Amino acid sequence: GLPVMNTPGSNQFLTSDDFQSPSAMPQFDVTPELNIPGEVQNLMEIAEVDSVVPVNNVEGKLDTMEIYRIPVQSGNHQSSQVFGFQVQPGLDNVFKHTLLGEILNYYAHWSGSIKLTFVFCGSAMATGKFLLAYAPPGANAPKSRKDAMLGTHIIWDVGLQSSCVLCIPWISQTYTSAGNVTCWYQTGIVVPAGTPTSCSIMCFVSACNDFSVRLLKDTPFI
Amino acid sequence: GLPVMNTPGSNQFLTSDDFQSPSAMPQFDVTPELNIPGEVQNLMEIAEVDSVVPVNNVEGKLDTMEIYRIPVQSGNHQSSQVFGFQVQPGLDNVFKHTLLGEILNYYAHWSGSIKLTFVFCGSAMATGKFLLAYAPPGANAPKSRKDAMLGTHIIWDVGLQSSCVLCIPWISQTYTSAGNVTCWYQTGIVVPAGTPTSCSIMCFVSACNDFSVRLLKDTPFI
Amino acid sequence: GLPVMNTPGSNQFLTSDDFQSPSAMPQFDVTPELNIPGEVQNLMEIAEVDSVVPVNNV
């Protein structure tokens, strides 16, 4: 009874199908759920957390805590570069193994805004100024302190603030075609008698709320 | 007519499926049911019945009625142990073949509370005292009458009551990690002239209403 | 269209099944029934009739 007609696709196993299946243990009442703290609904809750960037990824110190410390030297060098990098999460070595980088490497297309925080870890007696500069994608990195001043920049006085924040708006993926960030000595570091001479800066990266990902794929790390 | 499309899983025989089947004897009216006394809806109605425990399961008497009798001896032994066991239904030899043990061995996970009853089968002239003690799972069995008194216990006077009852609350399954029960001579048994000297105790086990079972499996006895 | 899933028992011939079947002569109007005397609905109408017993079966 009930005349019926089989269509193409019958009796195939499609690895991504979605069908009701027969239970092998129907007479078994399951343990009820517990209210465990710390539940997750979405992977973007992991990428919105700050993590420390290994900005000092040069030879001889890829296996020490020193990889995370930007060196600030003593004396008068008030126009020299402190650091610089291209902003390319997912592809570039300095951003590749962070919490944000590890997520982005599961997807073939992504886009959003990024947040960078810088923190000064010197003694409370040290004072000085840094110049933090941002170049957009398609622009060359500045070569001097003066042309970095002629673009988008902030002047950061560490005797007043211990930390600075930046939000970068046009991030996508695929000799890069990406924006960059650089830091310059505006003045030099000045200390009283009896304080350590050298010091360090640390970088933290995170994602802002408008971040999106597409086309789940396999990661290239295991 | 009616375009139709076969999905994966078509024309397979799944041993636990649930489908309507064609009757081979459609023109046959069945005998109506009779109201037979003693109908059962659930196996937990069998486990809530008391059954006698073979507490005396030692060598030389595994095939006699003596396996069920705890010996109470005559004279003055007022701090010695009478008996002791771990409370492990399903696994332990003394509980394994009872009505509760036989059910539990059909399931791979179970939990609830247990009820133990003790009955004194001596003459109506005998008097004395016993100390019944319970140790929780993770605790060692008491070594003396005094440290059994320092835990959870009841003092049972057989000249007043012929039976005692215990309810044990935290029972689950998998050098055991289970609770235990022990019995001690508080006073010794005292009789008049012309009564038997020795006597016996009997144990009954049962389940309390909150007992649950999961994952039907095969029993290891046939 | 209309996702569908074949169950066990598909494409078998069960001798006591009960299904609609396609007619091989759809354009043929059948002769109407006649009211013939003596219609039967049930075999117990045959057993409720007396019949002679061969008691002397020697």
Place this chain on the structure above:
Amino acid sequence: SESSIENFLCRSACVYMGEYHTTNTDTSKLFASWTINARRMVQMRRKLELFTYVRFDMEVTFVITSKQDQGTQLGQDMPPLTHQIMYIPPGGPIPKSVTDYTWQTSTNPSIFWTEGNAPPRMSIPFISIGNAYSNFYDGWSHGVYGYNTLNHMGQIYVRHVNGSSPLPMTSTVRMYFKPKHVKVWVPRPPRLCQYKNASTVNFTPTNITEKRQSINYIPETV
């Protein structure tokens, strides 16, 4: 919920496996047969013996596989094979050859099936002029002890459906049996001894349980 009667008993199992040929010189090897009862499957037998009276419907599925005999002749081109599965109710004619008239009686329900399709399946109702089946009978058949004729459930017979002078082939059938809509009365204790034959309750005496070291022994706690 998993200890309800339906979830405990309503489960499928292989209860008979048999072999039959298309040509042979024994003529009893040309068909396969089985008498329906639940006493030669030791795991189902024990679960059924917890009750005195039972009532259920039966569902039977058949898995059938064929082979060309290793005798000699190759290069064949054969159409798929057809099989006939006949159920005989209680009080029916029994075949004795594969050419018998009873393979055509109108009141023996029958199934015709050809290989390559889904496995065949028939559904049998509760067939008894009594009101329930009995697992235990303390009586005489009219004289055999322990055997009452109200427990007859019928028979199954399987043959090939070729024509005249067929080609040599060997088939195997496996029968999967499942009770449905089950009701039970008067619970009993579980079988403690091993079963000895399929028609009696005969047994050799068995120990009540296994031994331990002493009546005080409890194993050392971890």
Place this chain on the structure above:
Amino acid sequence: SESSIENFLCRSACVYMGEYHTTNTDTSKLFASWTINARRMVQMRRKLELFTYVRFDMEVTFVITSKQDQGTQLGQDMPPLTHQIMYIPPGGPIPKSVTDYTWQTSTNPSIFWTEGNAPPRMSIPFISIGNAYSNFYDGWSHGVYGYNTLNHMGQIYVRHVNGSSPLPMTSTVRMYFKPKHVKVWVPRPPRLCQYKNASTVNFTPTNITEKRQSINYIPETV
């Protein structure tokens, strides 16, 4: 939307491939077996380690292919082959031969399937007396470090369903596994080192990231 937990974890994968014969002189080559866990699939393992507690149902599909052994004998005419796929819950009997009694226990769910039809499929619920599974355990089994018994999920066993003296054949089974209705708790950092074995977290020390030329180096812009 593609970063939700369900879209990230609920995907099918081949986790076990095994071979088994109908006749052999080893008797362990007559059946195939697999213990269910998610630690020997390196790509699923890493995605699962981003969380500390998980809860899911399982869906398993089986792809099965056969072959006649290249030994010697040709000209055969065989019916299609039947297979049995048995699931054992935690706390169930394990077979040791293909002729064992446990292949017939009423509480081990089982599937019977013949070649040519759609691929078979069963659905397993969340089976644990705890409230979630754990990917990480900082404890002792009672003694193995890092192993807790609440993570038992059962086993799968596969054999042929012939009769007596079968013909030689070799089969291969592939198991496809998929979690469903998933919930996760307590996110973790991603695994940075390669996995070394399937039961521990053991590792050899790894670099934090790869090097570049200097702390100022940015590549020339196109």
